[PDB]
Design a protein around this ligand. Structure first.
Ligand SMILES: Cc1cc2nc3c(=O)[nH]c(=O)nc-3n(C[C@H](O)[C@H](O)[C@H](O)COP(=O)(O)O)c2cc1C
Ligand SMILES: [Ca+2]
Ligand SMILES: [Ca+2]
Length: 146
């Protein structure tokens, strides 16, 4: 086991970002598991060397209902030594664009994880050239940390 991508997606935008990151991480002969974070016991993260969380942002910059349980679930695990990163899909029409990226970044650092880079912030779906290149650069820099 190596790198885990746990994502929360409702309309598919964050899921599409998770798919792009995994494919890049595949090209480096890493072991990349792709999972949804809902109903996922947070204990599973300790089997991995790297962990990449991903979530969309819901009302008033709050985590979606599905991700707050997993976020609170992280309260009781030591992530010391785990190299982590965060991504998310939001909409700049809101004041708190991709607050979920900041929320999960603080929580992972709050539990001893080594945050290797600033989170990836995509608007809506990664359905154009520079969004795909944003994901491609983010995933490669994470692989350079390994
Ligand atoms: C009711 C509602 C509230 C939202 N609030 C925010 C927000 O506070 N900040 C933000 O960046 N995006 C917000 N969004 C936009 C979603 O984060 C955006 O549509 C995202 O791409 C959905 O990702 P998904 O396809 O993985 O579900 C909101 C969307 C809805 C419908
Ligand atoms: Ca986009
Ligand atoms: Ca663009």
């Amino acid at each position: 086991a190596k790198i885990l991508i746990a994502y929360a997606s409702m309309s598919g935008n964050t899921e599409s970002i998770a798919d792009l990151i995994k494919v890049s991480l595949d090209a480096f002969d890493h072991e990349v598991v792709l999972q949804e974070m809902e109903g996922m016991d947070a204990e599973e993260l300790l089997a991995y060397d790297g962990i990449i969380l991903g979530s969309y942002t819901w009302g008033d910059g709050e985590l979606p209902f599905e991700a707050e349980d997993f976020h609170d679930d992280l309260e009781n695990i030591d992530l010391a030594g785990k190299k982590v990163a965060v991504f998310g899909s939001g909409d700049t029409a809101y004041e708190l664009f991709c607050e979920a990226v900041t929320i999960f970044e603080e929580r992972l650092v709050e539990r001893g994880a080594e945050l290797v880079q600033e989170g990836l912030k995509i608007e809506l779906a990664p359905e154009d050239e520079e969004d795909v290149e944003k994901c491609s650069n983010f995933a490669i820099a994470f692989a350079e940390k390994f």
